[PDB]
Structure 1
């Protein structure tokens, strides 16, 4: 129907042998030892790029162990998509893995990392006039958008408008794929159907988030004061969602009871633009507002 293992596919790739699985040729001269069958990547004290290695593993996968001697390696599809969305060169990570990881890069592990680096979305969701539309940087993308009931049918025929792509981006498609390619401006209504049809037909689309196509108007009555409590995970989570230069809303999985709304109020203020806040239930809306 509309369920994707790729988001929740984390929890596998830890099984190897000893007869078929050979000691990694880098095992003699390799700062790490990538156990590809066990999916474990032990980052011992001998890795000089352990900080560089530690960050790369955290993107493509989840480091289960962070021991003082060596770390531990786990596989995460959301990490794989996140490490795919990380943007590190799939080949470049593998080789520094291969050279660093004494255990040779596993064949299945090597494919997933490259599959991370490039896949985790090869979709072609084009955008017009700084907005989202039914198009694609790649051709199979324009076909997906045009043949889309929500992307195409919900897409206005106009190729792109500075204001329409600005305003409408058939809802807000501020999460589309590569823009500045062939596409048509989509309406102001219903990206559920856009996503509910890329749902039904399994279109993993290499998506972005165009955060000042979070423009949306003359500036609202927002008091851009940072007097709301600021404490360090929120800001670097903000620094992650503020990214380079200007406020991008990402997905930032935050706890209710540790100042969750605090990042939202800042990002809402930072854009200096109209923003709505949605909480669980209305009674919690007052509690949270209280």
Structure 2
């Protein structure tokens, strides 16, 4: 507080929130920045100068809390300041630029916070010498304090691979973080891989920014890069591998993703299909070349329950290979306990994380700081939406009025079956039937998401068009997928948690949700990203269409609000629709008669 700040009569519910004690600079017209010192928040104008220069700086040193079109709510965090000094930035420069572009005097607490969040950058480093995690620090000053720490037990010494994760967490805790910047040009101990950036690949500007933020020194800075759906993360990883030119391993959490990234990699880089050996229960071949790649999903390394000897040979081979680069695509699942064996198993130098969503239910997402590193780059979602890099969606949330026909049983149903009982409302069937009619009238490919296989198959059967879920085999689901894509008999399909994420299905510009998870925001966000990567995200007059059929009179409204609040905060609003269109103009409605409603009620009473 640069004032006396005598408490105003209107500042009572302003519990240290009345931010008028600051002496506002007369350059408030030009400068775009406020500071909120009560919570560390930052208030940013979208209509004053210096904001274009300050936007990347605020992303680097701060995190945004909310970014609508008019005012961006940012927040300086120690995580973001560590990311800033890891990119290469410092407290004094941050304070100087902040006072240069700030309308307001710089707060003492914020000054102290940025002073504290300055790391010993360059002091603590680790290298791998023949599959050997050697902790090579620049001084014995590091060795004294680290041996002073009781966990541990120029100059380089060994720390065990499982102990590497624990000591990285510990050194982050004592705020002595390690930078992992591979000198792949200087290191020739690893086999260099003759892969070249083909002229057929040219890079987007924000992707070039993402590379150069972690290629500022020419070394590969290890961390996270968060890019939206369809941004070209495969292209970013291909460019990083082609400019590293070493043995590289990339794991993604689907065999379909294995299968698609292998073809993407052999397409847009000069690595050879001989050098790429694909590992799965389809085939477990190995490449015998000095340099190349072996791809598998996380399952064929995590599992030890039912493993083949050829799988054992392959995982032995990858254990033997000292890789120079690792990318954990869809990094939201690798910090799970059966999945965080990556450091314990794979000897790889540079650790990059590419994913769409950097959020989850628990705090395992922050473990990537001592698993792979901080966020090296992020692309602004609404900026790419207006840039056409991702889509523009007219989301329409459908508040289906609850039928008492199903509510009378739903209220007296036990808790494990209340969910399946209120998913299956005949009014919801009626609304979905007219919505499918209306969007096939508009000529849009529609994909329907249900959390339950039986509800998915019942909706699919009432449509007369097939279903795909997680228990459906891969051959049947791809047959149904190609039937939907090319065959005009299959105009719409019925997808599930194999369709929510980790697939490339951007044709469906229309999406209707009949069910979802209880409170998993990431499933809903990935379902939105399924159509955010749509091909017609660039044409004029485009708005994608998202629909959520949710039953009234429940907790499902609060559930959908919880699942949607991340997208609302992103900028993907959820508009209110209760009275739908074309109600009764549709002649023939699924379970329209009350006898039909009681029929479906006792049909689902057979299970519930």
Asked if Structure 1 and Structure 2 have the same fold, meaning a TM-score greater than 0.5 normalized by the shorter chain, the answer is yes
- What is the deviation of 1:78? 2.6
User: Cα distance, 1:238 vs. partner?
Assistant: 2.4
Q: Is the 8 A contact 1:34 1:103 kept in 2?
A: yes
Alpha-carbon distance change, 283 to 211 in structure 1, aligned in 2, over 3 angstroms: same
1:275 is aligned, of 248, 261, 264, to 248
Cα 1:11/1:250, change in 2 over 3 Å = farther
Cα drift, residue 222 of structure 1: 3.4
Matched residue of 1:64: which SS?
A: strand
Q: Distance in 2 between matches of 1:248 and 1:42?
A: 30
- 1:206/1:247 CA distance change after superposition, 3 Å: closer
Q: 1:185 to 1:101 in 2, by over 3 A?
A: same
Query: 1:133 aligns to what SS in structure 2?
Result: strand
Question: What secondary structure sits across from 1:105 in the alignment?
Answer: coil
Aligned residues of 1:61 and 1:75 also touching (Cα < 8 A): yes
SS in 2 for 1:252: strand
Aligned residues of 2:44 and 2:71 also touching (Cα < 8 A): yes
CA contact (8 A) 2:168 2:178 kept: no
Answer with 1 or 2: which has the greater Rg: 2
Cα distance in 2, alignment partners of residues 247 and 270 from structure 1: 9
Q: Which has the higher contact order (CA 8 A, sep 6+)?
A: 1
- Contact 2:84/2:90, CA 8 A, preserved across alignment: no
Equivalent in the alignment of 1:209: 182
- Superposed CA offset, 1:25-77 (max 9, x none): 99799774434335444455997654444443222113556788875432333
Report the alpha carbon displacement of residue 227 of structure 1 after superposing the two structures with TM. 3.2
Deviates more, 1:248-257 or 1:81-90: 248-257
Task: Give runs of aligned pairs for residues 235-274 of structure 1, distance below 5 A.
Answer: 235-245=208-218, 248=221, 250-255=223-228, 257-274=230-247
Q: Give the whole-Å Cα distance in 1 for the aligned partners of 2:124 and 2:94.
A: 23
Aligned equivalents of 1:86, 1:277: Cα separation in 2: 23
Deviation at 1:90, TM superposition (A): 1.0
**Other structure's SS at 1:183 match:** strand
- 1:200 and 1:247 mapped to 2: Cα distance? 24
Task: Map Cα deviations across residues 237-263 of structure 1 (whole Å, 9 max, x no partner).
Answer: 223333344655543224564432222
Secondary structure class of the residue paired with 1:277: strand
Counterpart contact for 2:87–2:213, Cα < 8 Å = no
Whole-angstrom CA distance in 1 between matches of 2:63 and 2:143: 34
User: Given that residues 135 and 157 in structure 2 are in contact (C-alpha distance below 8 angstroms), is that contact kept between their aligned partners in structure 1?
Assistant: yes
Instruction: Tell me how far apart the structure 2 counterparts of residues 258 and 190 of structure 1 sit (CA, whole Å).
Output: 35
Shift of 1:115: 2.3
Q: Which residue of 2 aligns with 1:133?
A: 134
**1-side partners of 2:91 and 2:203: how far apart?**
36
Q: Which range moved further: 136-145 or 88-97?
A: 136-145
Question: Cα offset for 1:265?
Answer: 2.2
- Pair 1:30–1:195, CA change in 2 (3 A): closer
Deviations 1:74-122 (A, max 9, x none): 2333322212324333123223423542422112211112223447998
Change beyond 3 A, Cα 1:8–1:18 = closer
Q: Deviation of residue 142 (structure 1)?
A: 1.2
Say which SS state the counterpart of residue 190 (structure 1) adopts: helix
Query: So what's the TM-score if we normalise by structure 1?
Result: 0.59
8 Å contact 2:22–2:104 — kept in the other structure?
A: no
Contact 1:121 1:204 in 2 (8 A): no
Structure 1 unaligned spans of 5+: 153-180
Q: Is the 8 A contact 2:62 2:76 kept in 1?
A: yes
Q: For 2:20 and 2:186, locate their aligned partners in 1 and report how far apart those are by CA, in whole Å.
A: 55
C-alpha deviation, 1:213, in angstroms: 5.3
Question: Does the 8 Å CA contact 1:33/1:102 hold for their aligned counterparts?
Answer: yes
SS class of match (1:56): helix
Give SS of 1:7's match: coil
Q: 1:223: Cα distance to partner?
A: 5.6
CA distance in 2, matches of 1:6, 1:276: 60
What is the distance in 1 between the residues matched to 2:194 and 2:10? Answer: 43
Instruction: Report the Cα distance in structure 1 between the residues aligned to 2:73 and 2:38, rounded to whole angstroms.
Output: 13
Structural mapping, 1:32-51, within 5 Å: 32-37=33-38, 39-42=40-43, 49-51=50-52
Query: How far apart, in 2, do the equivalents of 1:276 and 1:25 lie?
Result: 55
- Given that 1:219 and 1:273 are in contact with CA atoms closer than 8 Å, whether structure 2 keeps it comes out as yes
Change (3 A) 1:250 1:199: closer
CA positional deviation for 1:201: 6.9
- Unmatched segments (≥5 aa) in structure 2: 263-607
May I ask how many residue pairs the two structures share in their alignment? Answer: 262
Aligned CA distance change for structure 1 residues 272 and 149 (closer, same or farther; 3 Å): farther
Greater shift, 106-115 or 28-37, is seen at: 28-37
1:81·1:116 contact (CA, 8 Å) conserved in 2? yes
TM-score computed with the length of structure 2 as normaliser = 0.32
After superposing the two structures, state which structure 1 stretch, 114-123 or 1-10, moved more: 1-10
1:270 and 1:278 mapped to 2: Cα distance?
19
State the secondary structure of the residue aligned to 1:143: helix
Richer in strand (by share): 2
- Aligned CA RMSD, in angstroms, stands at 8.9
